[PDB]
């Protein structure tokens, strides 16, 4: 188990760690998060008490370095930093662990929720969507736009998700206009899976990362990408059986974790009704359909 220590907490803030969250008071003796499970990526995220504008946060993997957080009073935010002095890191962390100034990552033993949400998400792929090569961790916030959003404006601060556009020359072979528009299998299997992602695991990783950024930051372009990657599969007549079964599991745990009160803004009625009730794959997502109908029947 690993630890993300904090130099201090000078401003009141709600702190998230993966799907958990807690409140820290202004100048409270908080010095970080311990017992973080090794083997998964994680996200530590923030919403200031005095200004809920800009949710922001950091994706990281404790296997890739020793990271600590410090408040920057000039830029007005909690910043993730990497400590290259290993002995110093352990010494400060031990002092804090001994005085019980850290919260414990509160994982129930029965609980696979975080694994189920991040099964295909790897740090190396995150760092290609979020480009800041000098850091081993990745900053994301609520207002960051996507490359596709910027084509329709600072490129250094953008989310480089794979562009999906159903009415584009990439999606439609000349001479196969009706076929390719009504059955997106070409676009899914040849263009996206064989060509760009190389395999379904990378595709699902980006889909899962998009969802998590929509949920944890309210990032709109991430929500658009999540829905586009679902619709591309559901609108394809020919999808490998293992992908359909895995997608049903992926979406089930996403819909299970979504805050009930954020559904009006995180779920696109058109896409979900099309995917569950009209698409080629309308009968292939049994678990997702059942949780959607029992949890959000109004949307449908």
């Amino acid at each position: 188990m690993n630890t993300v220590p904090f130099t201090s907490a000078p401003i009141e803030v709600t702190i998230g760690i993966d799907q958990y969250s807690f409140n820290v008071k202004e100048n409270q003796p908080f010095h970080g998060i311990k017992d973080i499970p090794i083997g998964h990526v994680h996200v530590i995220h923030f919403q200031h008490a005095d200004n809920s504008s800009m949710r922001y946060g950091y994706w990281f993997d404790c296997r890739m370095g020793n990271f600590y957080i410090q408040y920057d009073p000039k830029d007005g935010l909690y910043k993730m930093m990497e400590e290259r002095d290993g002995a110093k890191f352990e010494n400060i962390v031990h002092n804090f662990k001994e005085r019980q100034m850290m919260v414990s990552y509160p994982k129930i033993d029965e609980d696979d929720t975080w694994y189920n949400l991040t099964e295909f998400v790897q740090m190396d792929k995150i760092r290609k969507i979020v480009r800041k090569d000098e850091n081993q961790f990745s900053y994301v916030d609520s207002s960051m736009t996507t490359v596709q959003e910027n084509e329709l404006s600072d490129p250094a601060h953008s989310l480089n998700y794979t562009v999906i556009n159903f009415k584009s020359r990439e999606a439609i072979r000349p001479g196969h206009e009706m076929e390719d528009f009504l059955d997106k299998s070409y676009y899914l299997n040849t263009v996206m899976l064989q060509g760009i992602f190389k395999n379904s695991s990378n595709y699902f990783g980006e889909l899962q990362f998009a969802f998590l950024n929509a949920m944890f930051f309210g990032n709109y372009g991430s929500s658009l990408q999540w829905h586009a990657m679902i619709e591309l599969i559901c609108s394809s007549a020919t999808v490998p059986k293992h992908m359909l079964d895995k997608l049903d599991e992926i979406l089930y745990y996403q819909i299970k974790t979504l805050p009930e009160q954020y559904s009006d803004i995180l779920l696109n009625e058109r896409v979900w009704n099309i995917c569950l009730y009209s698409s080629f794959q309308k009968n292939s997502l049994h678990n997702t359909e059942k949780i959607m109908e029992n949890k959000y029947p109004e949307l449908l």
């Binding site: 020359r169 000349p174 206009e177 528009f181």
Partner: protein, 237 residues
Amino acid sequence: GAMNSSNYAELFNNDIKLFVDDTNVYRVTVHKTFEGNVATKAINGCIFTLNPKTGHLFLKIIHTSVWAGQKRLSQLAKWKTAEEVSALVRSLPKEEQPKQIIVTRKAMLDPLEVHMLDFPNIAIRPTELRLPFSAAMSIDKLSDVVMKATEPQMVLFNIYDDWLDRISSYTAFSRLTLLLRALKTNEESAKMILLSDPTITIKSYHLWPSFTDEQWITIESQMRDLILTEYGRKYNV
């Protein structure tokens, strides 16, 4: 975006544009079978592609063989229309290609957009005008060429005959829409109005009779009366 009565004069400016109406592409008769079921029989159709400024009509005749062994024909017809309009645009010299294509039915937007991806600067637009272009097959010479076709064929017409020698394209389009609306509402009565005087004839190279300016005023008034008469019969007014 959409095209309506606020921006109506835009149809007659100097930016090349085409209306596309797909109503008559897939045409069927419905009949009983020997076993008492119901079956369709397709008949020849046409795409109505019109330049409202010049009167040039590109009538692509859709022969029933294009439907042979195909499924979901009402859906296919929209994509066949878009395929043929795209092929027409590609066949025209650059300086004759339209800057806008206006579809009379919104279901044509996505098929035409997809077939025209290679032409990102041609705008594909709907319209809020309810245009009576379905009644094109009530123009005898258009119906005759469509029904006699034994293979796919494109035929070119000027749907304004020689009117633009004497009137503006705004007035010519208004006359055409009034005539087509009348033919749509009561075909027999409209043709009787147009043909009742045997001394006024249709030139070999025209679609409509050779009315003088004053006679066109009379005909237009008779057509408006027909439409109002039919509205009164319909709604008991």
